[PDB]
């Protein structure tokens, strides 16, 4: 592991902790918490604290359903910005049905439950290296997010030393004070778009990271006066926030997709793994691009993928293989946006991965040629199907692909379609300004 | 006919006309005109004024192309509010290819050719007594349309109507001085709503009025400080404007749908008819409910239909058999909204009717309990197919059926799907204010 | 709260449209250091003392509402669907039961009455629960059918077909349902009582006569 009962408990008192958050992450992909006083830490560690775990069903919760709260000691971290009278720490948590048996429908537990299956297949660690992007907008005298971007930079700029990256650093310099291993930071294509990438780690140790991340980013931006936002495509016309996901199966401490004497040094494991992905790409969309706006990102021209194909030097591929190999050899799913439950993603992403390696599915011809230059008719004359165009197109493709269903669970499945048929259900009965300006003078 | 050449000509000299406007109607419906001076009335009657015709393909004009204007002598009318320095007349015109031949594409002459087909089947007429609904919003100092209703009246209300009646009379006591035969006017369900209904008429002769109306309503409403709009569903949660199309086929000067000692006094002529209109209700909705907002109207509730079926007593029926009979025996198609091209609607509507009468399709079980108590499964159980959920699904099915495509005809069909998928991608690539208020602080 | 420039009010349903505040009560009885509601061999691991106590709350439930939810506002929190327990029925599950039996057993075995709200008088409130909670332990009362299916999806009339009667609707509908119950009466103090019944009717008779602008949006103009 990393920490022990004793380590935690002496740390708290030597560092003076006065308040403990017990963090979990709901299905919709929001980070929730139930707060306790340093006094109760023990009954907390005894895995004894309880709660209404229908807080997880999100807003399609229907029945106060009791649930325990088992913290993972190694997901421990104290927050620095505080210390104002009592530093405040936090743990992540495995939810467990009333009877010592993990809660089947807990986002997190599901990843570990998807992880078990892989072990039975033999891979030792499944790792993820996130490239999550964000906009920092400016706030007002009132303190309200506005539409004012933070900077007027673009790809990789040296944003003068005060306003552009003076925020980008503050974040990066703090996460290290919390124990993150950031590989680095830059700027992004748009005015006000940023990105900080961190090291890789087990799916579950990386989803945590992700959750944590979004949080700190957001708490150090207000500290600077701006509004952080990882929403997919905030501003029309301008490029979006993606959150690419670099995967890499292992086999007893070795990278699986690596093959030195092979076709692009790509093992017949990765040729199969890429295959499972390429197969369920349209089915697992609703989960990796889970909201009504994730789809005004998936349109051609902004670098973001709109088709189902895999190359390693290309336009906007749904899959990407970073050239370097070795232990680094890794697939890069680029249609994953930061506003999808990191947890459920690894899952459905590590799931379609295992559906191929297994049935021994076959890789297709890597797209290097002119994929964008044809039509959805002419490409239809190939193994290049489109990625959905609305959340609804994306939900249909999901309820149908059986293997997809089994990756979440009869439970995490049901409520998800539920909360999403409603999210779609409201955005289309609504009437948006847009509709009114066209049809008010014309019709 | 009605007016004769020497007839018009005396009306102009005596009435002192100084400006003739040659009306025709575009594909999206927009009543456009080509304005000429009484000085050129002659070459206008002689059917010799040419003009770039692709002005009909709307915002999908590819190429300029010379077309003629054959004015109907009967669609003649003078304007009263333009009664000062030479009143200002308007005709309505048959666009014709350059050589001599009608324009295949002209919305209008397309109803006349879906009408020829009627005679070739034996019928003598066709009748449309449309009830069109409309909001009246106030303008401002500047003169801009706001979102402030003109009144706060409700179904058939009186004293509150006066602010919008003060207009509803102005509108209705002018159309009389325009030649109309307005059956009557009341006030509709939500505030600001209003509706006037006029005397039935032959397909073309009526749609001719549809157009006219929409225009005299806006002319007179602006001349009052308000902005008449025909958006299907302009305000959210509030009720939408509709434009029911009570139809009836004649055959030798006598109602073909009437049959005294018959189940519901209905003939086995109107049955095959109801049968057909039930056989393309989902594949002619793209035409009838042609915009993106027309689908914010079709949400269960506000009396708007949502499911395919018929009766003579029902909440929101797709079909509706007015009870009055005889020469009034009629089928009311209630889905058609005033944002639908009169002309092209009558086309898919009299074509989906005449594919039943011929093929002799047999109508289904008229409903009475509830099509709202059985979900989308317990409904898609008995020939109760919900109308499309978006312009886009609305198009998906329109293309899916032959009988319809032949109903407009290659050139009209093609430019329409063409003109309409464009309308869809913008609204689909667009990021609205809603998408934003949601995800900005949740994500 | 003030210290931080805000206001804090334990008011039941301050804002309409919006959830109200529910001060839920978790109840558990012992007899010599050992949780009495608890029972190793039994269905729902529930001692009879419990089913006995349960039938208690389920009986008088309609009555002591005048004492567990005493404000005029309190009846606008108990509207349908905001989780407010609108019906008299017990369960270990359901949209919003009046009694929720948690899952923890051992000594936590307990009965949660969610009828009660923060704008109640803690002590009185409490003596009336211990109250109907005991009528039942003493007269050996028969607990009813726990809530399976769900009754929300039913008429007031098919429910009425089960031992299911709604909760009082107005603070006035309550008081009278309180006066006519011999065990809350003798339960409270023949004095605490004459002064409570009374203190509220007057409350009610003061809400009842005012002219709330609501009516004006509504009648001033139309009529």
């Amino acid at each position: 592991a990393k920490y022990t009962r004793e380590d935690i408990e002496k740390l708290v008192k030597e560092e003076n902790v006065k308040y403990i958050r017990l963090q979990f992450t709901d299905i919709l992909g929001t980070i929730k918490n139930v707060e306790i006083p340093v006094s109760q830490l023990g009954k907390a560690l005894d895995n004894k604290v309880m709660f209404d775990g229908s807080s997880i069903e999100g807003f399609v919760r229907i029945e106060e359903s009791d649930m325990y709260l088992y913290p993972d000691l190694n997901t421990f971290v104290i927050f620095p910005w505080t210390a104002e009278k009592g530093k405040v720490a936090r743990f992540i948590c495995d939810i467990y049905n009333p009877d010592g048996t993990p809660f089947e429908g807990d986002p997190r537990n599901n990843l570990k439950r998807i992880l078990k299956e892989m072990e039975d297949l033999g891979f030792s660690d499944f790792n993820l290296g996130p490239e999550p992007e964000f906009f920092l907008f400016k706030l007002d005298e009132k303190g309200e997010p506005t539409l004012e971007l933070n900077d007027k930079g673009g790809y990789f700029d040296l944003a003068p030393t005060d306003l552009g990256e003076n925020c980008r650093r503050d974040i990066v310099l703090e996460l290290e004070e919390m124990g993150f291993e950031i590989e680095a930071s830059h700027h992004e294509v748009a005015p006000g778009q940023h990105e900080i990438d961190f090291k890789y780690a087990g799916a579950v140790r990386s989803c945590d990271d992700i959750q944590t991340f979004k949080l700190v980013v957001k708490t150090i931006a207000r500290k600077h006066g701006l509004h952080a936002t990882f929403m997919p495509k905030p501003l029309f016309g301008v490029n979006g926030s993606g959150m690419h996901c670099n995967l890499s199966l292992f086999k007893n401490g070795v990278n699986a997709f690596f093959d030195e004497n092979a076709d692009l040094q790509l093992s017949e494991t990765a040729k199969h793994f890429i295959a499972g992905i390429v197969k369920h790409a349209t089915s697992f969309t609703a989960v990796t691009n889970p909201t009504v706006n994730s789809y005004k990102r998936l349109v051609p021209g902004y670098e973001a993928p709109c088709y189902v194909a895999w190359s390693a030097q290309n336009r906007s591929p749904l899959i990407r293989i970073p050239a370097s190999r070795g232990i680094s050899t890794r697939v890069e799913v680029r249609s994953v946006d930061p506003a999808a439950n990191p947890y459920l993603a690894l899952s459905v992403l590590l799931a379609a991965g295992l559906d191929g390696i297994k049935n021994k599915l076959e890789a297709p011809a890597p797209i290097d040629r002119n994929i964008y230059v044809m039509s959805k008719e002419e490409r239809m004359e190939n193994g290049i199907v489109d990625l959905p165009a609305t959340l609804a197109e994306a939900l249909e493709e999901f309820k149908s692909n059986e293997v997809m269903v089994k990756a979440l669970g009869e439970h995490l499945f049901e409520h998800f379609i539920e909360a999403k048929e409603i999210e779609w259900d409201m955005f289309r009965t609504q009437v948006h300004p847009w509709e009114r300006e066209q049809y008010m003078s014309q019709y | 006919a009605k007016y004769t050449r020497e007839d018009i000509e005396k009306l102009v000299k005596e009435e002192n006309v100084k400006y003739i406007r040659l009306q025709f109607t575009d594909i999206l419906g927009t009543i456009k005109n080509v304005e000429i001076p009484v000085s050129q009335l002659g070459k206008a009657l002689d059917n010799k004024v040419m003009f770039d015709g692709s002005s009909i393909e709307g915002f999908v004009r590819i190429e300029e192309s010379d077309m003629y204007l054959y004015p109907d002598l009967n669609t003649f009318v003078i304007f009263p509010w333009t009664a000062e320095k030479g009143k200002v007349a308007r005709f309505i015109c048959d666009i014709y290819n350059p050589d001599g031949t009608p324009f295949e594409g002209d919305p209008r002459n397309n109803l006349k050719r879906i009408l020829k087909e009627m005679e070739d089947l034996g019928f003598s007429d066709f009748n449309l007594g449309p009830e069109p609904e409309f909001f009246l919003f106030k303008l401002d100092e500047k003169g801009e349309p706001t979102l402030e209703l003109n009144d706060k009246g409700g179904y058939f209300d009186l004293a509150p109507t006066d602010l919008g009646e003060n207009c509803r009379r102005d509108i209705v006591l002018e159309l009389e001085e325009m030649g109309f035969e307005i059956e009557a006017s009341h006030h509709e369900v939500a505030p600001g709503q209003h509706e006037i209904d006029f005397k039935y008429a032959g397909a073309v002769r009526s749609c001719d009025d549809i157009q006219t109306f929409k225009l005299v309503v806006k002319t007179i409403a602006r001349k009052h400080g308000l902005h008449a709009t025909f958006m299907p569903k302009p305000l959210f949660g509030v009720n939408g404007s509709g434009m029911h199309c009570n139809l009836s086929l004649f055959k030798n000067g006598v109602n073909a749908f009437f049959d005294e000692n018959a189940d519901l006094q209905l003939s086995e002529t109107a049955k095959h008819f109801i049968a057909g209109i039930v056989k393309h209700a989902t594949s002619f909705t793209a035409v009838t409910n042609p915009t993106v907002n027309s689908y914010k109207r079709l949400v269960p509730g506000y009396e708007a239909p949502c499911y395919v079926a018929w009766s003579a007593q029902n909440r929101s029926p797709l079909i509706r058999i007015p009870a009055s009979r005889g020469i009034s025996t009629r089928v009311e198609v209630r889905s058609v909204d005033p944002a639908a091209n009169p002309y092209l609607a009558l086309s898919v509507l009299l074509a989906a009717g005449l594919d039943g009468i011929k093929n002799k399709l047999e109508a289904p079980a008229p409903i009475d309990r509830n099509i709202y108590v059985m979900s989308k499964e317990e409904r898609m159980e008995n020939g109760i197919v919900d109308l499309p959920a978006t312009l886009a699904e609305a198009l998906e099915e329109f293309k899916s059926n032959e009988v319809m495509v032949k109903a407009l005809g290659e050139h009209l069909f093609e430019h329409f799907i063409e003109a309409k998928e464009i309308e869809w991608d913008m609204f689909r690539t667009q990021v609205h204010p809603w998408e934003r208020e949601q995800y900005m602080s949740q994500y | 709260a003030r210290k931080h420039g805000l206001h804090a009010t334990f008011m039941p349903k301050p804002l309409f449209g919006v959830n109200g505040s529910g001060m839920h009560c978790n109840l558990s009885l012992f007899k010599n250091g050992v949780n009495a509601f608890f029972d190793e061999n039994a269905d729902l691991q529930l001692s009879e003392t419990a089913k006995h106590f349960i039938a208690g709350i389920v009986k008088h439930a309609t009555s002591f509402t005048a004492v567990t939810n005493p404000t005029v506002n309190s009846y606008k929190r108990l509207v349908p669907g905001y989780e407010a327990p609108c019906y008299v029925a017990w369960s270990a599950q359901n949209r919003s039961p009046l009694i929720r039996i948690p899952a923890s057993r051992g000594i936590s075995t307990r009965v949660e009455v969610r009828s009660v709200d923060p704008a109640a008088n803690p002590y009185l409130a409490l003596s009336v629960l211990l109250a109907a909670g005991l009528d039942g332990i003493k007269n050996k009362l028969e607990a009813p059918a726990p809530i399976d299916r769900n009754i929300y999806v039913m008429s007031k009339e098919e429910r009425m077909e089960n031992g299911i009667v709604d909760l009082p609707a107005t603070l006035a509908e309550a008081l009278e349902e309180f006066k006519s119950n011999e065990v809350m009466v003798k339960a409270l103090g023949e004095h605490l009582f004459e002064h409570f019944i009374e203190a509220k009717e007057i409350e009610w008779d003061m809400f009842r006569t005012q002219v709330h602008p609501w009516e004006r949006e509504q009648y001033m103009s139309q009529y």
């Binding site: 399609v60 409603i422 | 949601q438 | 449209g17 349908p80 669907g81 919003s96 769900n150 929300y152």
Partner: peptide, 15 residues
Amino acid sequence: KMLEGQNAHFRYKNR
């Protein structure tokens, strides 16, 4: 009703 339940739920996680 639960719908008003899930309704009074879905005017808070949808605003």
